[PDB]
Amino acid sequence: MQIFVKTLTGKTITLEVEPSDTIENVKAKIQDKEGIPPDQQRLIFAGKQLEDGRTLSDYNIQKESTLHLVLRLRG
Amino acid sequence: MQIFVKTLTGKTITLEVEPSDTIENVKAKIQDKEGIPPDQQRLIFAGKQLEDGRTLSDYNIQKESTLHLVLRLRGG
Ligand SMILES: [Cl-]
Ligand SMILES: [Co+2]
Ligand SMILES: [Co+2]
Ligand SMILES: [Mg+2]
């Protein structure tokens, strides 16, 4: 299954995922393509913030869903 | 010879077919009626997926048999 992530540059990347992957698994896949560490990633879907221990299916994230990556700065 | 084709939402299409029609021939008749490419179609009769290359009679599909059309999610 493929999903898309609108990254910090505004470009779009594609991830190979499975329906039960956690948000932290997704974050790991994002750090591989983009070089943003997971602790600094905030993932947003249908306007909503996604939580680490929940799964894609928990949010009914299906194939070709786009997630939006935002920097989490905790200064 | 007539058969019924049922979709996921329970819509029913009727097809005019022949006993020796191939499964490819049936997919082509569904393409004509519904506009779905044959490559996106899976056809099931009595729980069994029908295979390209085989005929209606290979599966004992007779007048008034019902087939279920399952669509390949387009790409993924
Ligand atoms: Cl015919
Ligand atoms: Co007839
Ligand atoms: Co009768
Ligand atoms: Mg896949």
Q: Where are the domains of chain B?
A: 1-76
Distance CA B50, CA A39 (A): 50
Helix (H) or strand (E) segment spanning residue B18? none
Tell me the CA–centroid distance for residue B76 and ligand 3, in Å.
40
The widest CA-to-CA distance across chain B, in whole angstroms, is 35
Q: Quickly name the fold that domain B1-76 has.
A: Ubiquitin-like (UB roll) (3.10.20)
> What's this structure's resolution in Å?
2.0
CATH, domain range A1-75: 3.10.20.90
Q: Quickly tell me which residue has 């994230």 as its tokens.
A: A61
Find where tokens 């949010």 sit.
A59
Separation between Cα atoms, residue B33 and residue B44, nearest integer Å: 18
What residues in A contact B76, CB-CB < 8 Å?
A: 1-2, 63-64
Chain A residues with CB-CB distance to B75 below 8 A: 64
Contact A2 B73 (CB under 8 A): no
Q: Which three-class secondary structure string do you get for B22-58?
A: EHHHHHHHHHHHHCCCHHHEEEEECCEECCCCCECHH
How far is B64 from B76, CA to CA, in rounded Å?
33
Structure tokens at B33: 């009626």
Bridge partners, B22 (sequence order): B55
